[PDB]
């Protein structure tokens, strides 16, 4: 038993991290088959980032201006192209450590593991969630750009995230592996509004089920509620509205614990209206929303 | 910026995980050079675990009773011996993926990453702390025994923990890689007292420094205190006593933030006597003690 915020084993992704240098800018890239993926602002200086014309800046670059280094060995760049906000560097050799992989664009509320890297070397791994406003609350120092987020299904790595920038508010923004940003953001050093964030209601409920499975039951109440009554409380407390799709995804957890989804919703409503009174759930003094229903089933 | 509970990249350890089966019991083992390390209770049935005589049970076993499988390939066992609570199976081949490594016995309050495994396959990685009472609050299902904890220094893996059992209280206990248990525990299915746990004071302080570095400063107070006055408050709230060794280890963080250690202690004292009033520090509604001063410096 016990419950931890677990990340996926990162070995398959560590074998794909390289260092990409263009001019005096260096960041991380993802080497899969004979292509290296990295943020396109690798071609920018700090002054460029105030208002960059990426097409004009890329046109000044040739294949030999991109230094791609995997461990101690150098890769030969035989082609380069821009796809949305990522650079795709065609190299002469296929990464012998390429895992089976897919590129996927996740939805808000879904979770993934981040391998934080610097100069192409991994430093740590952690599990996080795509916020409903399409930011992530990561740990990204300078030079961490190009670090990637992923999920693993047995032997297949689904890459879903590449880190591009930190907003003035301290949260982080990035793209899928086709270079399309999650959210309204652009790769330019200008003030950019993230929307109102909300709590991922279905994730909180999944984690309340994880708590019951692990013995924390003090929050179980004698009440029930309706989907519409609960969503009234949800909107007040800036929780995402619960849908019947969310009720269905929680089904297996409902079956395992013997607690109806709407009964668990009534417990959550009581927790939102009355707080926790200094008590804890699974060692947390607040409601956790970084576990999906799939995460809870996988761990439990 | 940002701050996450990061685990070490686990790839070097994933290459060392094998499946060990003895009779009908299967768990995880650690394959380094030509030796496989695993918990000795792999030779026990559930009924054996009530009161096992390991020497007598091991004597009934021969080299060919140990099935060691690394991925799809089988290892040939050419020797077996018991060192305290671990089994050491000498196999005919050196693990070609053996990283540079050391065996270390950590101290309470220190942290490490756990690669949770089942049937020799990794499922997740997470960062945790050795509690002052020598338990760990992990996530370990049946068959997770033999999963290991570790730290990584550049290219060197310091193995410090092997999981052996879950106590009736739901916390977990294990050994170093020489087979000596952390704590008073024994590998037998009997009720065993973990002592009073305490909060790792030096870790809380390190994480308060991480908070200041990341912009959370509301808890900074106009007070200071003394080491002895603070320890008076520490004992009341079941915090470990702060020593001058702890003050020295916090030095670099004190220098970076410009906040004296004893001033930070005064802020912590105020937090212990008055609570957080529903506010948060680095997204947590309680005081975190799973980051060492070294962890904070490494991340920041
Ligand atoms: O985040 C990173 C690097 S990881 N960069 C970004 C990204 C977005 C907005 C601004 C900046 C300023 C710093 C800078 C300079 C040169 C190349 C990239 C970056
Ligand atoms: O924890 C595990 C397996 S991971 N086991 C332990 C350990 C300590 C006390 C009791 C038990 C009971 C279950 C059992 C049965 C057979 C071999 C080992 C174990």
Coordinates of C-alpha atoms in Angstrom, one line a residue, chain A residues 11-118:
Chain A
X11 CA 15.6 5.3 -19.0
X12 CA 14.0 5.1 -22.5
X13 CA 14.0 8.9 -22.7
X14 CA 17.5 9.5 -21.2
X15 CA 18.9 7.6 -24.2
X16 CA 17.3 10.2 -26.5
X17 CA 18.5 13.4 -24.9
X18 CA 21.2 15.4 -26.8
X19 CA 22.7 18.8 -26.6
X20 CA 21.9 21.3 -29.4
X21 CA 24.0 24.5 -29.8
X22 CA 23.3 27.2 -32.4
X23 CA 25.6 30.3 -32.2
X24 CA 26.0 30.9 -28.4
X25 CA 22.6 29.4 -27.5
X26 CA 22.5 25.9 -26.2
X27 CA 19.6 23.8 -25.1
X28 CA 18.3 20.2 -25.1
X29 CA 17.0 18.2 -28.1
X30 CA 15.2 14.9 -28.6
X31 CA 17.0 12.4 -30.9
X32 CA 14.6 9.9 -32.4
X33 CA 15.6 7.9 -35.5
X34 CA 17.6 10.3 -37.7
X35 CA 15.9 13.5 -36.5
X36 CA 16.7 15.8 -33.6
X37 CA 13.8 17.9 -32.2
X38 CA 14.4 21.0 -30.2
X39 CA 12.8 24.5 -29.6
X40 CA 13.3 26.8 -32.5
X41 CA 14.4 29.6 -30.3
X42 CA 17.7 27.9 -30.1
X43 CA 18.5 30.2 -33.0
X44 CA 17.8 33.3 -30.9
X45 CA 19.9 35.5 -28.7
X46 CA 18.3 37.1 -25.6
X47 CA 17.8 40.3 -27.6
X48 CA 16.2 38.3 -30.4
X49 CA 13.6 36.9 -28.0
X50 CA 12.1 40.4 -27.5
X51 CA 10.5 40.2 -31.0
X52 CA 11.9 37.4 -33.2
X53 CA 11.2 36.8 -36.9
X54 CA 12.0 33.1 -36.8
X55 CA 11.7 32.7 -40.6
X56 CA 14.2 35.5 -41.1
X57 CA 16.5 34.3 -38.4
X58 CA 16.4 30.7 -39.6
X59 CA 17.3 31.8 -43.2
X60 CA 20.6 33.1 -41.9
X61 CA 21.4 29.6 -40.6
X62 CA 22.9 26.6 -42.5
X63 CA 23.2 22.9 -41.5
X64 CA 26.7 23.4 -40.2
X65 CA 25.6 26.1 -37.7
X66 CA 23.7 23.5 -35.6
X67 CA 26.0 21.6 -33.2
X68 CA 24.3 18.5 -32.0
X69 CA 26.2 16.4 -29.4
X70 CA 25.0 13.1 -27.9
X71 CA 27.2 12.3 -25.0
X72 CA 30.7 12.7 -26.2
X73 CA 30.0 12.1 -29.9
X74 CA 29.0 14.7 -32.5
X75 CA 26.2 14.3 -35.0
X76 CA 26.4 15.4 -38.6
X77 CA 23.4 17.7 -39.6
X78 CA 22.3 17.0 -43.2
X79 CA 19.0 19.0 -43.1
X80 CA 17.0 21.4 -41.1
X81 CA 13.4 22.6 -41.1
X82 CA 10.9 24.5 -39.0
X83 CA 7.6 23.0 -38.0
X84 CA 5.5 25.5 -36.0
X85 CA 7.7 26.2 -33.0
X86 CA 10.1 23.2 -33.2
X87 CA 13.3 22.8 -35.2
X88 CA 13.8 19.4 -36.9
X89 CA 17.4 18.6 -37.5
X90 CA 18.0 15.7 -39.9
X91 CA 21.2 13.9 -38.8
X92 CA 23.2 11.3 -40.6
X93 CA 22.8 8.5 -38.0
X94 CA 19.7 6.9 -36.5
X95 CA 19.8 6.9 -32.7
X96 CA 20.5 3.2 -31.9
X97 CA 18.6 3.8 -28.6
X98 CA 15.4 5.0 -30.2
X99 CA 12.5 3.4 -28.3
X100 CA 9.1 2.7 -29.9
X101 CA 7.4 6.0 -29.6
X102 CA 4.5 8.2 -30.7
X103 CA 3.8 11.9 -30.7
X104 CA 0.5 12.8 -28.9
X105 CA -1.2 16.0 -28.0
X106 CA -2.7 15.6 -24.5
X107 CA -5.7 17.3 -23.1
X108 CA -5.8 19.6 -20.1
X109 CA -6.1 17.6 -16.9
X110 CA -4.0 14.7 -18.2
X111 CA -0.6 14.0 -16.5
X112 CA 2.9 13.2 -17.7
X113 CA 6.4 12.8 -16.5
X114 CA 9.1 15.4 -17.2
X115 CA 12.8 14.6 -17.6
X116 CA 14.5 17.9 -16.7
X117 CA 17.7 18.2 -18.6
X118 CA 20.6 20.7 -19.0

